[PDB]
Amino acid sequence: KDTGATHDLVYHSKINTFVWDVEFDIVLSDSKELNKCYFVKCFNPYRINGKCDFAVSSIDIFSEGKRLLIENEFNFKITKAVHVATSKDVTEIVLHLSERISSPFPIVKEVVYLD
Amino acid sequence: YDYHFEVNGTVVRHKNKGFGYMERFFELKESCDERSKLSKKQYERFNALFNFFEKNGVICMAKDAGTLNTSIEINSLAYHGKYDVMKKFIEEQSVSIEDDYKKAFFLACLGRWEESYDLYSNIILNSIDESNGCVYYLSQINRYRIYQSITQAVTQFNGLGLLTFGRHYKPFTDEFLARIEREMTNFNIDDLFNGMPFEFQKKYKILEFLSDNQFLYDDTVKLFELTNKVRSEMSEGSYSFGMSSDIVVLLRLYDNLRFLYENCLWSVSFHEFHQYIRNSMSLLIEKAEYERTRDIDELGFSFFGKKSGFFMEYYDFVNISRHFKIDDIKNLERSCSIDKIRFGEQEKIEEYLVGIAEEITKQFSANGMNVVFYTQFISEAKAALYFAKYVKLSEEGLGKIVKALLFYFPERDLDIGKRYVWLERLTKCNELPKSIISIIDDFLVLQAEKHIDQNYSEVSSNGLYSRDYGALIKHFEKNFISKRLSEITLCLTQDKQKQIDFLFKLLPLLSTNAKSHLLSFKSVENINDLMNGIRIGLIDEFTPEHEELIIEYLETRKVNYIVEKEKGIQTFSSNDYMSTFGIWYFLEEINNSKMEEFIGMDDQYDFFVDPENFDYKKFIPSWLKNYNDKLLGKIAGNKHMKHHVIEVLKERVKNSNDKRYLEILMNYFI
Amino acid sequence: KLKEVFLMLDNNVVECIKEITESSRNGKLVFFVGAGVSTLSDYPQWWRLVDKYHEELYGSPKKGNYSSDEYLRIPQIFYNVKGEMAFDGILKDFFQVDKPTNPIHDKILAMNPAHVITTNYDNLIDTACWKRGKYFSVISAEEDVANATSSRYLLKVHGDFRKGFKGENVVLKEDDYLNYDQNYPLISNLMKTIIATHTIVFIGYGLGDYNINMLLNWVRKLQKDSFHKPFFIRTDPSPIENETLIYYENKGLRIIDAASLIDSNEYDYLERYSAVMDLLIESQENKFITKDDEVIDYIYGKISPLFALQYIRKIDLKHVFEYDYHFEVNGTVVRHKNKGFGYMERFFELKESCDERSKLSKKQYERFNALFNFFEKNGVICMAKDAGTLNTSIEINSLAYHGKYDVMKKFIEEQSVSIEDDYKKAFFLACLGRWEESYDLYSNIILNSIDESNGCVYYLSQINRYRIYQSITQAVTQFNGLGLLTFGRHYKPFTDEFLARIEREMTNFNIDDLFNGMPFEFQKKYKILEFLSDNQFLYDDTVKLFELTNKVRSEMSEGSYSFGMSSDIVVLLRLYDNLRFLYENCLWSVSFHEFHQYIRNSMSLLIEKAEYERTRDIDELGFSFFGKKSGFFMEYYDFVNISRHFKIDDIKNLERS
Structure with missing residues (x-):
């Protein structure tokens, strides 16, 4: 549990999320493979939208150092997480938190409070 | 220390043991006959004294005071950014060393630092022989400061500019960077004052502080x-006589500002002054707000209900734009x-905001670019355009501002999302015209034309497009x-898939025939396609086949859930498709009732389909x-689910003391 | 090449360069400029004029060779026979010309001299100073000594041509050299005084010249081994012989020989002038730290004067070492703006390993022990790279802080034995309420501190006495205006005679100039005390x-929460540092209002942050097991601080919020 990589973890309550500098490898739908990916969340309570939209927070997916666009179902099964220091404790910590918190995409890279 | 001067504009006696010369001077000022009594040269000297004191703002004794007014007027092109007038004044032919001092200050302001260095060197060369100590001292000071700024800029550029700019820049050559480094070798500013004639050291003691490392510490x-x-x-109100600390602090700030900007000193661009402002x-505004709140608490709400203890004007706007970054402004906005x-x-x-816009257009429309000037100018423009939300603008000025913000602001500092935020902030106070x-x-x-290229792709830092x-x-x-x-769409073709996707986001702006043609190209065949269209594609209505x-998906998932009960194992889940359907049903979007049979899988789905019978534990x-504003309002609308959520929110805010839960329970629900 | 020059230096050259650079730093350096420096830039030498005089006197031109006396005799005969008009006509013909300066002048001015003495009559150094921007007073006559605009001189002893090309303003013939001491009393006096109170470097002269020998005779007769030997920079094609070197060293000189450092051709005079002038002097303005015993010597020299005080703030140390290192409040050093040998790193390495300590010679282990004790007591641990588990502790040893009034009463009653005890007694009296005795005791301490000391107690006693005087005046003003109502009686704490006496005494004192009047040794050693007389010590x-x-x-x-360490710890650490520094040095500054407001x-900030962090354990451990444990709680120091520095309304506001 105790490690030197946890000193940068941040908890944000307005959206119930964890911000951390970490890169992910993801198997999508058990058929697609991607490496060095991450998320960015944007909290927006006042956005001009229609009845189809109901979520304050909008998420975006980046892969490699490039934006990624996915249309198919985003079935998510983590397989490896790496932090700058390269400690492997993150690989089990990520699972522990993800099980702990109920909201989707429990850990992201950056959060933008539009208001 | 014979007398004590005040920002109030009155003087007082202090530890003086002798004749009250200042009181006699004021008596002479009051009465014309006494001024007639004096001699002739004394009369001329008295006129000079009167001019000086009136110009700098000393009025009369403290006992003989009154309802003295106060106003600030800074006479300097640099504090108003009259860039074109500065350039014209630079281009003309000088007549005296004072005009050369002013020209050097303007040259340094405009970013061209090497010309400033050369001009200051020439001024120093000539002034010593011209026997003008003040300009010699001040020019030595300013040349040293310019050298320091040049060196820091060189280091910062060679460190990070090649990365942030995308290409290594060389604003200065190497011959110049060697020459100045050789000239300013072992030069120390701390003995500059002590090396001057003692007459200068006697007459101009008050300027010694300009040679110190840091001032504005008291x-x-x-x-x-x-x-x-x-x-x-x-x-x-012990501060002076019946003047709250607010007035004294503000007038001291104005004094420092005016003295630095008017006398053409180059210490106005350094970190210490910006931090001080x-x-x-920040402290003034915070204190004003606290006083307002306490007065509201003590007396009734109708007393000072929306009173503004602090009042902004042109000077406060320019200061906040110049010296604050975006984070500082947001801190004041959230405090x-x-x-x-x-x-x-x-x-x-309004006249200040349009000038900034014109300067941006001039800077970036033309091929030429003064990088150093562009890095000391973009911050003020950004901050002013951000702070411009609170002021009412005219139609033509608003048009100029919007055009400059949307077409000419460099993308390196204002990407698409920040562009959108800045643009939207302006409409809060002014209704959008045609x-x-x-x-x-x-x-x-x-942007639609831009999207022709295959490699082109919008990049945003906040997911706004x-x-x-x-x-x-x-x-x-x-x-x-x-x-x-519309006509762009009418000439559209299948192979322009990127244009297809791009203008799929702008369906409401297209015409009937155009949208018919576009929808003729795409269709929905599965649930995944349905939600892809709903997200991107704007499927407004759930067709019966949808x-x-x-329902077919729901029955398939019912079978899968039965087989899962048999398994007793669930690896992981990413997105709850059932919850979206349940919320849509609650939002009166799905009129069918078959899924009501498909109940008991997801607690959220049950909550969103049959709130009355759902188990709330x-x-x-x-x-x-x-949930967003509309969904929370809807949840407040229903009766089967109001008081239970009241209870849970109350319990959470009691135990957690969280602010978001209090916000929802106060603004919405009860 | 330059590295080779730095390498082959003997001990003598290194010591000479050390002394020259140090005296340049202190602001007392002087150059005696010769004639070769004025020939590097072309300018008609004297021998050309002697040749022209010989040609005009006898029809024949120069024959054979000229001895030393001929240069001074031939002009004399020419003047005597033909007439003055010819002498000055030839002078104007030969000297009326403009010539460029040379790099040696720029280097000399870059050395930052206080004064500059010269035997030249050209205006080359004038132009050099003007272009470099320096301001010097030119003294080339007798009436100029009285009315001098500034306090740094460009002394041309033999004259100039700023009042005409006449032969009377200069010193060029044997009659001029005979009546010098009678026609130039003031200039000679001033030159001797400058020589006797400064460090002198001779450039471009050559041994055996007239002026060198005349000055050496004066030095011989007019002194008693109570002066500093000048330095000599010799630049001639061949290396100096040992017999001449020892003979001139015994005669009151220190020679630096250019030909020894580097080898060059016969006529490359600029090369050998530049090899020694600045490329070796200014470039050696840095330290010479290269050994495991020089590091301790330098650090001891820098740190020793701070032993007189009790405790030093960590941030202040950044000024003691001249921005060479950053000191954090937690106790970790970091490199910044230092390019030479890393001496703090080597000191820490010595601290870690005992074997390296054993390598230190005798007479240097005790200095290392003293430095180690000093640093350990202050709280500096190690570098930031090797940082361990830093802790937080508080300890203040002043009896005034804990409010033990009976103990200070007893101490005041008890007899004293040293000036430090009287100092502490005065501070206790100030915190006891006897303004009169505190002022009298401080005056007595100022009187008794005449004896040899560091000047620390004297300076701090001046500051404290002025502060007490201000306090007394404020009390008097408040007592008779408001005290009449506070108690209903005209309370007269002070007798009128004492008030008149103190007001008379302190009417001239100016706290601003107190630091600047002290001896330069005090001004260069205790510079961190300069901030104690203003508000400047609460700025950062x-x-x-x-x-x-x-x-x-x-x-x-x-609403964010971080799972690392509190972001405000620096506030608490700085607060404790300031409290300790002010209380444990016996300074009245603790009674100011601004310090109260700062505390x-x-x-307030610390309490607000602690309260905010407290309640997160319900929105943290109520959603997931993950959480934190670190927190803040009140203690003894918190209680005494909040008692002393708070009013009732502040406490009420904190209780409400």
């Missing part, structure tokens, strides 16, 4: 008087109710058709942290 | 606090 410490809490309960302004403070002299602030609508339509058309621009367009005008976009497909309060 | 702390407050409040507004604001 002024910063004196700011602690604005953080006192005893005053609101009981205040004496930041601290002073006090800035919406409750009114702004004055809006024509001048002209700005046309400008934004032109921007959208230009052209769809948001279109939504903003449509919000203030329900009926609108883009003719250029509903039947949804399974309710998770965190669910409330993802 | 308040700036940092104002920034940290905004940062923390923004974090709380966002109040710091404590």
Whole structure:
């Protein structure tokens, strides 16, 4: 549990999320493979939208150092997480938190409070 | 120390043992006959004294005071950014060393630092022989400061500019960077004053502080008087005579500002001055807000209900734009109710915002670019355009500002999302007219043309794209058709898949035939396609076949869930498709009732389909942290689910003491 | 090449360069400029004029060779026979010309001299100074000594041509050299005084010249081994012989020989002038730290004068070492702006390993022990790279802080044995309420501190006495205006005669100039005390606090939580540092209102942050097991601080919030 990589973890309550500098490898739908990916969340309570939209927070997916666009179902099964220091404790910590918190995409890279 | 001068504009006796010469001078000023009594040369000297004291603002004794007024007027092109006039004054032929000093200050202001260095060197060369000590001293000071700024800029550029600019820049050559480094070898500023004639050391002692490493250290410490809490309960106004600390601090700030900008000193661009202004302004505004709140508490709400203890004007606007970054402005915006403070002299602030826009257009429309000037200028423009939300603008000025912001602001500092935020902030105070609508339509058309290239792709730091621009367009005008976009669509073809996707986000702006043609290209065949279209594609209505497909999915998932009960194992889940369907049903979007049979899988789905019969002990309060305003209002609307959520929110705010839960329970529900 | 020059230096050259650079730093360096420096830039030498005089006197031109006396005799005969008009006509013909300066002048001015003495009559150094921008007073006549505009001189002893090309303004013939002491009393007096109170370097002269020998005779007769030997920079094609070297060294000189450092051709005079002038002097303005015993010597020289005090703030140390290193409040050093040998790193390495300590010679281990004790007591641990588990502890040893009034009463009653005890007694009296005795005792301490000392107690006693005087005056003003109502009686704490006496005594004192009047040794050793006379010693702390407050409040507004360490710990550490420094050095500054306000604001921020962090354990451990344990609780120091520095309304506000 105790490690030197946890000193940068941040908890944000307005959206119930964890911000951390970490890169992910993801198997999508058990058929697609991607490496060095991450998320960015944007909290927006006042956005001009229609009845189809109901979520304050909008998420975006980046892969490699490039934006990624996915249309198919985003079935998510983590397989490896790496932090700058390269400690492997993150690989089990990520699972522990993800099980702990109920909201989707429990850990992201950056959060933008539009208001 | 014979007398004590005050920002009030009055003088007082202090530890003087002798004749009261100042009182006699004021008596002479009051009466013309006494001025007649004096001799002739004495009369001329008295006139000079009168001119000086009136110009700098010393009025009369403290006992003989009155309802003295106060106003600040800084006479300097540099404090108003009259860039063109500065350039013209630079281009003319000088007549005296004073004009050369002014020209050097303007040259350094405009970013061209090497010319400033050369001019200051020439001034130093000539002034010593010309026997003008003041300009010699001040020019030595300014040349040293310019050298320091040049060196710091060189280091910062060679460190990070090649990365942030995308290419290594060389604003200065190497011959110059070797020459100045050789000349300023072992030069120390600390003995500059002591090496001057003792006549200068006697007459001009007050300027010694300009050779010290840091000044404004007593002024910063004196700011602690604005953080006192005893005053609101009981205040004496001991600061001077009946002047709260607010007035004294503000007038001291104005004195420092005026002295530095008027005398053409180059210490105005360094970190210490910016930090001092930041601290002073923030503390003043915070104290004003606290006084307002305490007065509201003591007396009734009707007393000072929306009173603004602090009042902004042109000077405060320019100072806040220049010296604050975006983070500082946001801190002040999230610390006090800035919406409750009114702004004055809006024509001048309107005339200030348009000048910034024209300067941006001049800087970036032309191929030439002064990088160093562009890095000391973009910050003020950004901050001013951000702070311009609180002031009412005219139509033509608003059009100029919007055009400059949308077409010419460099992308390296204002990406698409920040562009959208800055643009949207302006409409809060001013209702959108047709002209700005046309400008934004032109921007959208230009982006559509940009999207022809296959490699082109919008990059945003907050997930805001052209769809948001279109939504903003449509919000203030329900009926609108883009003719250029319409004809663009009419010539559209299948192989332009990127254009297809791009203008799929702008369906409401297209015409009937155009949208028919576009929808002729794409269709939905599965649930995944359905939600891809709903997200991107704007499927407004659930067709009956879509509903039947949804029911088919639901029955398939029912079978899978039965087989899962048999398994007793669930690896992981990513996205709850059932929850979206349940919420849509609650939002009166799916009119079918078959899925009501498909109940008992997801607690959220049950909550969103049959709230009356759902078991609420399974309710998770965190669910409330993802819904938006409309959904929360709807949840408040229903009766079967109001008081239970009241109870859970109350319990959570009691135990957690969280602010978001209190916000929802107060603004919505009870 | 330059590295080779730095390498082959003997001990003598290194010591000479050390002394020259140090005396340049202190602001007392003087150049005696010769004639070769004025020939590097072309300018008609004297032998050309002697040749022209010989040609005009006898029809024949120069024959054979000229002895030393001919240069001074031939012009004399020419003047005597033909007439003055010819002498000055030839002078104007030969000297009326403009010539460029040369790099040696720029280098000399870059050395930053105080005065500059010269035997030249050209205006080359004048132009050099003007272009470099320096301001010097030119003294080339007798009436100029009285009316001097500034306090740094460009002394041309033999004259100039700024009042015409006449032969009377200069010294060029044997008659001029005979009546020098009678026609130039004031200039000679001033030159001797400058020589006797400064460090002198001879450039471009050559041994055996007239002036060198005349000055050497004066030095011989007119002194008693109570002066500093000048330095000599010799630049001639061949290396100096040993017999001449020893003979001139015994005669009151220190020679630096250019030909020895580097080898060059016969006529490359610029090369050998530049090899020694600045490329070796200014470039050697840095240290010479290369050994395991030089490091300790340098650090001891820098740190020793701070032993007189009790405790030193960590941030202040950044000025003691001249921005060479950054000291954090937690106790970790970091490199910044230092390019030479890393001496703090080597000191820490010595601290770690005992074997390296054993390598230190005798007479240097005790200095290392003293430095180790000093640093350990202050709280500096190690470099930031090798940082361990830093702790937080508080300890103040002053009886005034804990409010033990009976103990200070007894101590005041008890007899004293040293001036330090009287100093502490005066401070206790000040914190006891006897303004009269405190002022009298401080005056007595100022009187008795005449004896040899560091000047620390004297300076701090002056500061404290002035502060007490201000306190007395403020009390008097408040007592008779408001005290009449506070108690209903005209309370007369002070007799009128004492008030008149103190007001008369302190009417001239100016606290601003107190530091600048002290001896230069005090001004260069105790520079961290300069901030004690103004508000300047609370500047950086308040700036940092104002920034940290905004940062923390923004974090709380966002609702974010960090799982590392508290972001405000620097506030607490700085607060304790300032309290310790002020209380444990017996300084009255603790009674100022601004310090009270600073402490109040710091404590308010800390309490607010602690309260905010407390309640997160319900929205943290109520959603997931993950959480934190670190926190803040009140203690003895917190209680005494909040008692002393708070008013009732501040406490009420904190209780409400």
